[PDB]
Design a protein around this ligand. Structure first.
Ligand SMILES: O=C(O)C(=O)CC(=O)C(=O)O
Lengths: 384, 384, 384, 384
């Protein structure tokens, strides 16, 4: 069965007692024993919960993994994976342009001696080769990257990692299982911040780690319980509900993004445009090869200054100025003051992040309405 | 004024837009800015959420702390504290009889070199002083302990700790802020598995860390966001709801526990009985001095064999055989088979845990109803 | 089992598939067939829902009835009963001082010829008898009444109504099953606005109709499904959750009320006091006879003009000025502008409701704290 | 603002206090006054609720109405409209083939004399016009009809209805606002069971009545509060969440429906097919003219007997045998034993409802997978 079928039906008719099509929400923190010294499949929600189990199976199926571990946030899924595979003295190799939260977590802990971290431009074969020569225990890959949507060869990185015996984990948040499948590309693990596209409705905060090896699933589950990062039952339910429309949401959002990309290619005030589909985007060839779609995330550089930017923004009404991405509603953010405000000004410029770069998480509103709304912003930027 | 008033009214009327008496559930994962580079008090749920903020204030207030950080599980509240206060090379002194999850966590990470752990009998003055001489960075106290309900001097232990420069954190789950206040006894932090008494309804899994120092709150908050362990908004809602009846719940449950002890004090089949109110109970006098009540948890050894055990249990119907405690419903567990089945039989015995020891988490059903139920249990225990 | 045991254990361990102690929330609107022409116990939520079934069982049991039908509001439970036992031509006899929503509903449909309504002072036997001679098909009793708390003889009225062939229904909202059981006093049915005391947490809106006769239950169930007033599954879950602490909630709210009553008796600014516990209170002897407690609701007339009352309310802090009652938090209401705002001053006065009468819905905050707050209001009232 | 833009953004950023993008869930049953006699927009949740308001505005906007009243069920929305526009002596003209629940409701109350009802074949000019000449106060239209998908001329019926002073209401559940807009076709009111397509996730039960005249919205709102059929806050939240994806869901469901129709037209075992897009389908010219799409509901008569039907259903695995429709998951039902089981076979026969008619509520799974499943059922229908 195709991904559209899996997303819609996985977990349906789970209820064996009442014949409910949609599974109930098992909020119970505990479960009675069948008899003395005879517990059932679950004995304590923190360790195992029936509702979390259903969504874990659905997410594992969508990525083609053996099983999944749902965590309470995407950041705790990242913390779970690093906790399991790294101890003081061990080395982690991560992308030089990875998610700000991820960088901050690794940096903060490595600065305490908890483990070693090496940030590398994984697109640079020489740089990458040298990092892997240091024999890391874990290699994190994140593609496309934010906010320039730069793409790196997942299959190649995972292979080189496997060559030196490092476990590979791919943060597939930006494209979701509907537009990219890292396990099918050679990764040992794939994780997501379910807070984004998977839930798709901006009202659930959760993370997940999916593994190709069932023994690794069990190890992850063991550690998730041990440090207490398993996800809640209610969030599990809403996440599963959001998942039901994952495919049509991703296809329409992507279709909308392509329409916006095409329109922006004609705009004079668009100094630079970024999207995996653009032949000139860093790693486009790779994207065309390893992705099932180019994605709904995009970004562009407005020609002008801070007031031109404030003018542009002030002219919008269908894009909400806010953090995050992946929801059904269109959002816009200014990297220099939002996603990368925690990055040194010189660094941002050093990272190729312009002070006038705006990133758009395309929603599923009508594409022409969204484009007409951008037209209004551009009209406003050009007025003095 | 009084804690009963705090639990009931904290958070009420928070709504300034619609005038709702009960605050709404703020599930939104993100928040809009008022203008470019002008965020509001909240920018991302994982970092800060309006509903979680409210329940944190209620919990802080209930323990007399400056602030609280709600985590997704009690275990992650313990992991958060250890993560903030220990780094490779630092030492943690924990109770030799602390909660199983706490023990397993500290042990598993200490084995990896993340930090050092020394498990000590904090009731053994000589043993305690020696460990503190190791100059730990953190000292964890957990009283009463489970399942023998032994009690230790929190005020003293915290004083000693502070002297050696160690930060003290007390796991107050067993009694809740309604029956004991560690901060009042000189602790730097008090934490609870809100999954227990605080929520009181067995349908929420959450943890919380409350600090005396506001600077410590800010730091615990930064780290909780960093490693991703902040609790959910929905759980925050149901938790605060459960909190509204904490005082009446604890009062009635304690009364029923006291009534059950009495009845048990006539059972030729009760080989031994444990409760902090009994004069022969380890640490009873300290208990009478630092606690506000003796608690709703109790346990007793069944004079007989496994067969005698299965029989007694088989004759109950108002006590559910299950893990956990703190809920309005009465539960019973067999440590050897549940709580401590992870210990070798001799190890359990060494720890003073009998193969026929039964723990009761007293609920708020009718006392007489509860005693009567036990009556039938014993009747069967006898029967050939 | 006693009330407290019923309220706490109803529904526990219902989950036979995963053994959840707390029943899961069955939100599913549809159920599958076990095969062709093979329905299940449930087929359509609007008709039958597993979570609604549980709470209906609990409520029927708390009032000692055969069964219950949970409706979406207290008003629709009232509308359901009238729809079932009245058609054009039939007569309904109701209390002259019944709930304002009940009055408005009966009046509004009577005005359209849907049925005839007769409002009588059921405390007046000849009047009561005269009305019963008209041969009503249904008689509604509501005791105590709002806001004066007048009490009438439920057993007597139900007795008289039964001999003329009228079905009796009692609105037991004000006292709840914990303080009064109309089915035992002779009624055919008892209904409540679960929105108040039963839920007790001001975050659920629902109603319930409980019948002595099982046949009447299937009747009410058929009609509730027919006109679509069945309660929702999520509300059913939050209501059952609230039900868990009904007994200690009523007990404590009741004690705080008596203490407050006692206090007001010593207040000069208190012109009149109203509480079933007071000998002088209308129907006091009947209350002491038919009630298991005198209730948590009370009202008093302030000695002074409007500015005096504003002053009094303005000095308060532990009572929220709002409609509704039955929550854990203490609420205060000015009948002339709130509960009875819709009623000419001539009608209000005629009905015996002062322009300075205040109603208190006692919560479970600390009693001393509550009185200390009233003292603040009084001090301000007499403050010039 | 196109419908996709409205469905996705209506109500977004409603929270002015915290700036939440997604509106929080207002469960609060009561609201405080900003002072004595200074109530707020909301004073009692059963009357007005902030979360119900948001979804009401969204539903109203999608149908182009002035406002909407959300009820607890689709049946109570139907009961609310008939309650407002009919009283004893008044006449209701309803579709001869309307929804079973609707028929039962009107029949049951007309039999008690609550009002008069006339079931007419609205596709027959003679019968339709003779009924309108009876001067009804209300005319209910339901197109397409279940389970044959017959379509009637809404603009024509509403035109003739207005001529005789009747109010027109259209039950637009089957197509939803995304595929049909009765107000734009001249109706006074449009109602829906939100339990179906609007919510689309089978975990909400709700109804809604949308009116073109703001004065009628007020009247319907007054009555909804009066008889207590207003929908719940939690349901309002989940329904709004479901609305977010209405357009892509209907589009895809419809697209799949067309692919299934095309396929079934090739099955020798399909002796009769029904779908509005079919040239020979009763009312096709009207459908093509008044609908924005032909819809996702379809039906067909299996060539064979009851054992054949059994074999066919048994061969399916992606279609759940269950009542209801409109969810993201594909469902199938056998009218004779499910939807119209309570219709004497003679009646079903006179109604053109075959004993082997199967209705399909097309979901959003991959269309090829669904077709393959169907082929499997057919290959099994042949093994006999
Ligand atoms: O005026 C007539 O004869 C019509 O027949 C009008 C009509 O059908 C419509 O407005 O749909």
């Amino acid at each position: 069965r195709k991904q559209a079928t899996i997303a819609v039906r996985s977990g349906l008719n789970d209820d064996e007692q009442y014949g409910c099509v949609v599974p109930p929400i098992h909020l119970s923190s505990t479960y009675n024993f069948t008899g003395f010294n005879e517990p059932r499949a679950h004995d304590y929600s923190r360790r195992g919960n029936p509702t979390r189990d259903v969504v874990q199976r659905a997410l594992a199926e969508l990525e083609g993994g053996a099983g999944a571990v749902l965590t309470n946030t995407g950041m705790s899924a990242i913390h779970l994976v690093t906790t399991v595979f790294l101890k003081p003295g061990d080395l982690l190799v991560a992308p030089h342009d990875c998610y700000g939260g991820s960088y901050r977590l690794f940096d903060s802990l490595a600065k305490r001696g908890c483990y070693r971290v090496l940030f590398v431009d994984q697109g640079d074969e020489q740089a990458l080769r040298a990092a892997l020569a240091e024999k890391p225990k874990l290699v994190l890959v994140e593609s496309p990257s934010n906010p320039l949507l730069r793409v790196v060869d997942i299959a190649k990185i995972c292979h080189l990692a496997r060559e030196v015996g490092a476990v590979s984990v791919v943060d597939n948040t930006f494209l979701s299982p509907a537009l990219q499948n890292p396990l099918a590309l050679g990764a040992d693990l794939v994780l997501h911040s379910c807070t984004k596209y998977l839930n798709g409705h901006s009202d659930v905060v959760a993370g997940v780690v999916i593994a190709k090896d069932p023994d690794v699933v069990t190890e992850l589950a063991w550690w998730a319980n041990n440090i207490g990062v398993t996800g809640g039952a209610f969030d599990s339910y809403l996440l599963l509900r959001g998942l039901r429309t994952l495919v049509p949401r991703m296809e329409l959002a992507q279709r909308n993004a392509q329409a916006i990309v095409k329109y922006l290619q004609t705009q004079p005030l668009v100094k630079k445009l970024y999207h995996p589909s653009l032949p000139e985007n860093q790693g486009h060839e790779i994207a065309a090869r390893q992705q099932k779609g180019f994605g709904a995330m995009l970004s562009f550089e407005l020609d002008g200054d801070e007031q031109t930017l404030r003018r542009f923004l002030g002219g919008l009404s269908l894009f909400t100025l806010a953090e995050s991405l992946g929801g059904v509603e269109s959002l816009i953010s200014h990297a220099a003051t939002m996603t990368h405000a925690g990055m040194a000004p010189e660094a941002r410029a050093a990272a190729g992040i312009s002070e006038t770069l705006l990133r758009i998480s395309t929603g599923i509103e009508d594409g022409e309405d969204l484009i007409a709304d951008l037209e209004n912003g551009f009209r406003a930027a050009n007025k003095g």
